[PDB]
Structures are given as C-alpha cells and as structure tokens.
Amino acid sequence: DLAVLRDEKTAITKGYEALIKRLGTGDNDIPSLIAKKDYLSLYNLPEVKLMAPLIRPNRKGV
Amino acid sequence: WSKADSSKIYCHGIAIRVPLVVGDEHMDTSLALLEGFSVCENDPRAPMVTRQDLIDVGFGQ
C-alpha cells in the first residue's frame, strides 16, 4: 500500500528477497552448498527459476 | 545525394548521372541507416542511446 513502483521493479525486488531468504541454515541452502563447493546445485534452485522470466530473452544464454 | 534530384550523385561536387530512372527504388531507406533495425514513427519518450548498447536491446523496444 505504501509503494509507488510498478509490478516489474516490485517483482524484481520480491525475487531478490525470496532469493535472500534462502540464506539461512540447513542443507539445500546456499551456505552449505558453498561449504561443499557444490556450485552446480545453485543453478537448479527454484528462485532463479521464478526470476528467469524477467531476464532479457534474446541474450539470456550469454 | 538528395530526393527531388535522385537521378544525380555528387562526388566532391561533381554531379554524376544514373543510367536509369527511379521514383520509389530510393524512397525506402528504412534499412540503410542501421543493420538490424528499422525506422519507425517519432517518439520522444524513447531514450537516447549509442551504437554500442544496441546489442543488448530487445524487440518492440
């Protein structure tokens, strides 16, 4: 209610928020994976999967 | 060169002639400015850019 931004920037901000909330403790989170050096399991997170539609589609691979 | 005299081509002021005649073959220059773009109706809201950032543009933009 106390906001003036549009759905786009708000969606970006909420995606970042959700991606940060995964910064807690417990496996399946980014800290444990970093400790295990499992840099691959990060690519398969669900949060990146929810923020992907927001990426520029013509250069998302590069 | 310029329209209304398209049958002429200046080279250091030296006017040259075209062996042909055209009234529309030249009127369409929408693709002679940039490589992968096309002119459209004027719109001031659209932001000014350079020739480099063009690579990171999308469609309908």
PDB file of all heavy atoms in Angstrom, chain B residues 1-2 5-10 15-23 25-26:
ATOM      1  N   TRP B   1      23.731  12.935 -51.950  1.00  0.00           N
ATOM      2  CA  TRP B   1      22.551  12.804 -52.786  1.00  0.00           C
ATOM      3  C   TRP B   1      21.350  13.302 -51.998  1.00  0.00           C
ATOM      4  O   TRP B   1      21.403  13.432 -50.772  1.00  0.00           O
ATOM      5  CB  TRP B   1      22.343  11.356 -53.237  1.00  0.00           C
ATOM      6  CG  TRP B   1      21.850  10.456 -52.156  1.00  0.00           C
ATOM      7  CD1 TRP B   1      22.607   9.692 -51.322  1.00  0.00           C
ATOM      8  CD2 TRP B   1      20.486  10.221 -51.789  1.00  0.00           C
ATOM      9  NE1 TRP B   1      21.800   8.994 -50.456  1.00  0.00           N
ATOM     10  CE2 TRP B   1      20.494   9.303 -50.723  1.00  0.00           C
ATOM     11  CE3 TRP B   1      19.261  10.699 -52.261  1.00  0.00           C
ATOM     12  CZ2 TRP B   1      19.324   8.852 -50.120  1.00  0.00           C
ATOM     13  CZ3 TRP B   1      18.102  10.253 -51.662  1.00  0.00           C
ATOM     14  CH2 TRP B   1      18.141   9.338 -50.601  1.00  0.00           C
ATOM     15  N   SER B   2      20.267  13.572 -52.719  1.00  0.00           N
ATOM     16  CA  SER B   2      19.052  14.070 -52.095  1.00  0.00           C
ATOM     17  C   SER B   2      17.870  13.723 -52.984  1.00  0.00           C
ATOM     18  O   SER B   2      18.015  13.502 -54.188  1.00  0.00           O
ATOM     19  CB  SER B   2      19.121  15.580 -51.859  1.00  0.00           C
ATOM     20  OG  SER B   2      17.894  16.079 -51.359  1.00  0.00           O
ATOM     21  N   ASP B   5      16.118  15.055 -56.740  1.00  0.00           N
ATOM     22  CA  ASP B   5      17.170  15.024 -57.746  1.00  0.00           C
ATOM     23  C   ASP B   5      17.859  13.667 -57.760  1.00  0.00           C
ATOM     24  O   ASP B   5      19.042  13.568 -58.103  1.00  0.00           O
ATOM     25  CB  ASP B   5      18.195  16.133 -57.503  1.00  0.00           C
ATOM     26  CG  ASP B   5      18.919  15.978 -56.184  1.00  0.00           C
ATOM     27  OD1 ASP B   5      18.259  15.648 -55.178  1.00  0.00           O
ATOM     28  OD2 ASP B   5      20.151  16.186 -56.151  1.00  0.00           O
ATOM     29  N   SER B   6      17.127  12.614 -57.387  1.00  0.00           N
ATOM     30  CA  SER B   6      17.725  11.304 -57.160  1.00  0.00           C
ATOM     31  C   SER B   6      18.471  10.788 -58.382  1.00  0.00           C
ATOM     32  O   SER B   6      19.283   9.865 -58.254  1.00  0.00           O
ATOM     33  CB  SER B   6      16.649  10.305 -56.747  1.00  0.00           C
ATOM     34  OG  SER B   6      15.630  10.238 -57.725  1.00  0.00           O
ATOM     35  N   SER B   7      18.223  11.362 -59.553  1.00  0.00           N
ATOM     36  CA  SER B   7      18.958  10.978 -60.751  1.00  0.00           C
ATOM     37  C   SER B   7      20.379  11.519 -60.769  1.00  0.00           C
ATOM     38  O   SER B   7      21.067  11.345 -61.786  1.00  0.00           O
ATOM     39  CB  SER B   7      18.204  11.455 -61.992  1.00  0.00           C
ATOM     40  OG  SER B   7      16.814  11.209 -61.869  1.00  0.00           O
ATOM     41  N   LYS B   8      20.835  12.159 -59.694  1.00  0.00           N
ATOM     42  CA  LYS B   8      22.161  12.749 -59.631  1.00  0.00           C
ATOM     43  C   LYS B   8      22.881  12.237 -58.395  1.00  0.00           C
ATOM     44  O   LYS B   8      22.257  11.930 -57.374  1.00  0.00           O
ATOM     45  CB  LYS B   8      22.097  14.278 -59.597  1.00  0.00           C
ATOM     46  CG  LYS B   8      21.227  14.887 -60.684  1.00  0.00           C
ATOM     47  CD  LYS B   8      21.748  14.578 -62.081  1.00  0.00           C
ATOM     48  CE  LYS B   8      23.064  15.285 -62.372  1.00  0.00           C
ATOM     49  NZ  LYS B   8      22.946  16.766 -62.270  1.00  0.00           N
ATOM     50  N   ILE B   9      24.206  12.154 -58.494  1.00  0.00           N
ATOM     51  CA  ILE B   9      25.050  11.696 -57.392  1.00  0.00           C
ATOM     52  C   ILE B   9      26.297  12.567 -57.373  1.00  0.00           C
ATOM     53  O   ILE B   9      27.094  12.532 -58.315  1.00  0.00           O
ATOM     54  CB  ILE B   9      25.437  10.216 -57.532  1.00  0.00           C
ATOM     55  CG1 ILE B   9      24.194   9.326 -57.514  1.00  0.00           C
ATOM     56  CG2 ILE B   9      26.390   9.812 -56.421  1.00  0.00           C
ATOM     57  CD1 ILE B   9      23.454   9.312 -56.198  1.00  0.00           C
ATOM     58  N   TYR B  10      26.461  13.360 -56.320  1.00  0.00           N
ATOM     59  CA  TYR B  10      27.593  14.269 -56.237  1.00  0.00           C
ATOM     60  C   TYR B  10      28.816  13.564 -55.667  1.00  0.00           C
ATOM     61  O   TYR B  10      28.710  12.727 -54.765  1.00  0.00           O
ATOM     62  CB  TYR B  10      27.243  15.491 -55.389  1.00  0.00           C
ATOM     63  CG  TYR B  10      26.192  16.368 -56.025  1.00  0.00           C
ATOM     64  CD1 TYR B  10      24.853  16.237 -55.691  1.00  0.00           C
ATOM     65  CD2 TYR B  10      26.542  17.321 -56.969  1.00  0.00           C
ATOM     66  CE1 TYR B  10      23.891  17.037 -56.277  1.00  0.00           C
ATOM     67  CE2 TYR B  10      25.588  18.122 -57.560  1.00  0.00           C
ATOM     68  CZ  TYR B  10      24.266  17.978 -57.211  1.00  0.00           C
ATOM     69  OH  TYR B  10      23.315  18.778 -57.800  1.00  0.00           O
ATOM     70  N   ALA B  15      28.615  16.317 -60.164  1.00  0.00           N
ATOM     71  CA  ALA B  15      27.361  15.608 -60.376  1.00  0.00           C
ATOM     72  C   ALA B  15      27.533  14.505 -61.414  1.00  0.00           C
ATOM     73  O   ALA B  15      28.048  14.743 -62.510  1.00  0.00           O
ATOM     74  CB  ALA B  15      26.274  16.583 -60.823  1.00  0.00           C
ATOM     75  N   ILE B  16      27.098  13.295 -61.064  1.00  0.00           N
ATOM     76  CA  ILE B  16      27.091  12.162 -61.972  1.00  0.00           C
ATOM     77  C   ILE B  16      25.644  11.753 -62.205  1.00  0.00           C
ATOM     78  O   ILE B  16      24.768  11.980 -61.366  1.00  0.00           O
ATOM     79  CB  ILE B  16      27.901  10.970 -61.425  1.00  0.00           C
ATOM     80  CG1 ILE B  16      29.309  11.414 -61.023  1.00  0.00           C
ATOM     81  CG2 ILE B  16      27.945   9.854 -62.455  1.00  0.00           C
ATOM     82  CD1 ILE B  16      30.081  12.095 -62.123  1.00  0.00           C
ATOM     83  N   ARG B  17      25.416  11.095 -63.336  1.00  0.00           N
ATOM     84  CA  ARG B  17      24.093  10.673 -63.765  1.00  0.00           C
ATOM     85  C   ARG B  17      23.900   9.178 -63.548  1.00  0.00           C
ATOM     86  O   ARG B  17      24.856   8.401 -63.477  1.00  0.00           O
ATOM     87  CB  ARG B  17      23.879  11.003 -65.244  1.00  0.00           C
ATOM     88  CG  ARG B  17      23.570  12.463 -65.524  1.00  0.00           C
ATOM     89  CD  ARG B  17      22.169  12.826 -65.063  1.00  0.00           C
ATOM     90  NE  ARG B  17      21.149  12.027 -65.734  1.00  0.00           N
ATOM     91  CZ  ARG B  17      19.843  12.128 -65.502  1.00  0.00           C
ATOM     92  NH1 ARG B  17      19.387  12.995 -64.607  1.00  0.00           N
ATOM     93  NH2 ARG B  17      18.991  11.356 -66.163  1.00  0.00           N
ATOM     94  N   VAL B  18      22.640   8.788 -63.441  1.00  0.00           N
ATOM     95  CA  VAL B  18      22.244   7.389 -63.296  1.00  0.00           C
ATOM     96  C   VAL B  18      21.742   6.899 -64.650  1.00  0.00           C
ATOM     97  O   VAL B  18      20.889   7.563 -65.255  1.00  0.00           O
ATOM     98  CB  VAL B  18      21.161   7.210 -62.215  1.00  0.00           C
ATOM     99  CG1 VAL B  18      21.746   7.480 -60.843  1.00  0.00           C
ATOM    100  CG2 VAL B  18      19.975   8.127 -62.473  1.00  0.00           C
ATOM    101  N   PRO B  19      22.239   5.766 -65.164  1.00  0.00           N
ATOM    102  CA  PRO B  19      21.757   5.287 -66.466  1.00  0.00           C
ATOM    103  C   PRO B  19      20.287   4.897 -66.469  1.00  0.00           C
ATOM    104  O   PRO B  19      19.742   4.544 -67.519  1.00  0.00           O
ATOM    105  CB  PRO B  19      22.649   4.068 -66.742  1.00  0.00           C
ATOM    106  CG  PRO B  19      23.838   4.245 -65.872  1.00  0.00           C
ATOM    107  CD  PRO B  19      23.333   4.928 -64.645  1.00  0.00           C
ATOM    108  N   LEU B  20      19.633   4.954 -65.313  1.00  0.00           N
ATOM    109  CA  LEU B  20      18.249   4.529 -65.162  1.00  0.00           C
ATOM    110  C   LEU B  20      17.418   5.675 -64.586  1.00  0.00           C
ATOM    111  O   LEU B  20      17.884   6.810 -64.460  1.00  0.00           O
ATOM    112  CB  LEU B  20      18.167   3.274 -64.285  1.00  0.00           C
ATOM    113  CG  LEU B  20      18.646   1.959 -64.909  1.00  0.00           C
ATOM    114  CD1 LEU B  20      20.126   1.991 -65.252  1.00  0.00           C
ATOM    115  CD2 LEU B  20      18.336   0.794 -63.981  1.00  0.00           C
ATOM    116  N   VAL B  21      16.171   5.363 -64.247  1.00  0.00           N
ATOM    117  CA  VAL B  21      15.261   6.303 -63.604  1.00  0.00           C
ATOM    118  C   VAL B  21      14.526   5.562 -62.496  1.00  0.00           C
ATOM    119  O   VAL B  21      14.173   4.388 -62.652  1.00  0.00           O
ATOM    120  CB  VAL B  21      14.267   6.918 -64.611  1.00  0.00           C
ATOM    121  CG1 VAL B  21      13.567   8.125 -64.004  1.00  0.00           C
ATOM    122  CG2 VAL B  21      14.980   7.296 -65.899  1.00  0.00           C
ATOM    123  N   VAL B  22      14.296   6.244 -61.379  1.00  0.00           N
ATOM    124  CA  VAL B  22      13.634   5.638 -60.230  1.00  0.00           C
ATOM    125  C   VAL B  22      12.836   6.708 -59.503  1.00  0.00           C
ATOM    126  O   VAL B  22      13.248   7.870 -59.428  1.00  0.00           O
ATOM    127  CB  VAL B  22      14.650   4.972 -59.280  1.00  0.00           C
ATOM    128  CG1 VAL B  22      15.154   3.665 -59.871  1.00  0.00           C
ATOM    129  CG2 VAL B  22      15.808   5.915 -58.995  1.00  0.00           C
ATOM    130  N   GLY B  23      11.686   6.304 -58.971  1.00  0.00           N
ATOM    131  CA  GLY B  23      10.847   7.176 -58.174  1.00  0.00           C
ATOM    132  C   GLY B  23      10.513   6.577 -56.823  1.00  0.00           C
ATOM    133  O   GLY B  23      10.089   7.291 -55.908  1.00  0.00           O
ATOM    134  N   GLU B  25      12.447   3.224 -55.900  1.00  0.00           N
ATOM    135  CA  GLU B  25      13.541   2.342 -55.510  1.00  0.00           C
ATOM    136  C   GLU B  25      14.404   2.974 -54.425  1.00  0.00           C
ATOM    137  O   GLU B  25      15.051   2.259 -53.651  1.00  0.00           O
ATOM    138  CB  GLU B  25      14.395   1.986 -56.728  1.00  0.00           C
ATOM    139  CG  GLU B  25      13.733   1.021 -57.704  1.00  0.00           C
ATOM    140  CD  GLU B  25      12.583   1.644 -58.469  1.00  0.00           C
ATOM    141  OE1 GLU B  25      12.353   2.862 -58.313  1.00  0.00           O
ATOM    142  OE2 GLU B  25      11.907   0.916 -59.228  1.00  0.00           O
ATOM    143  N   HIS B  26      14.423   4.305 -54.350  1.00  0.00           N
ATOM    144  CA  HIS B  26      15.179   5.028 -53.336  1.00  0.00           C
ATOM    145  C   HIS B  26      14.340   5.474 -52.150  1.00  0.00           C
ATOM    146  O   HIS B  26      14.888   5.655 -51.056  1.00  0.00           O
ATOM    147  CB  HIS B  26      15.847   6.263 -53.956  1.00  0.00           C
ATOM    148  CG  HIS B  26      14.879   7.293 -54.451  1.00  0.00           C
ATOM    149  ND1 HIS B  26      14.449   7.342 -55.759  1.00  0.00           N
ATOM    150  CD2 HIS B  26      14.265   8.319 -53.815  1.00  0.00           C
ATOM    151  CE1 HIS B  26      13.607   8.349 -55.907  1.00  0.00           C
ATOM    152  NE2 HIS B  26      13.476   8.957 -54.741  1.00  0.00           N
TER     153      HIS B  26
END
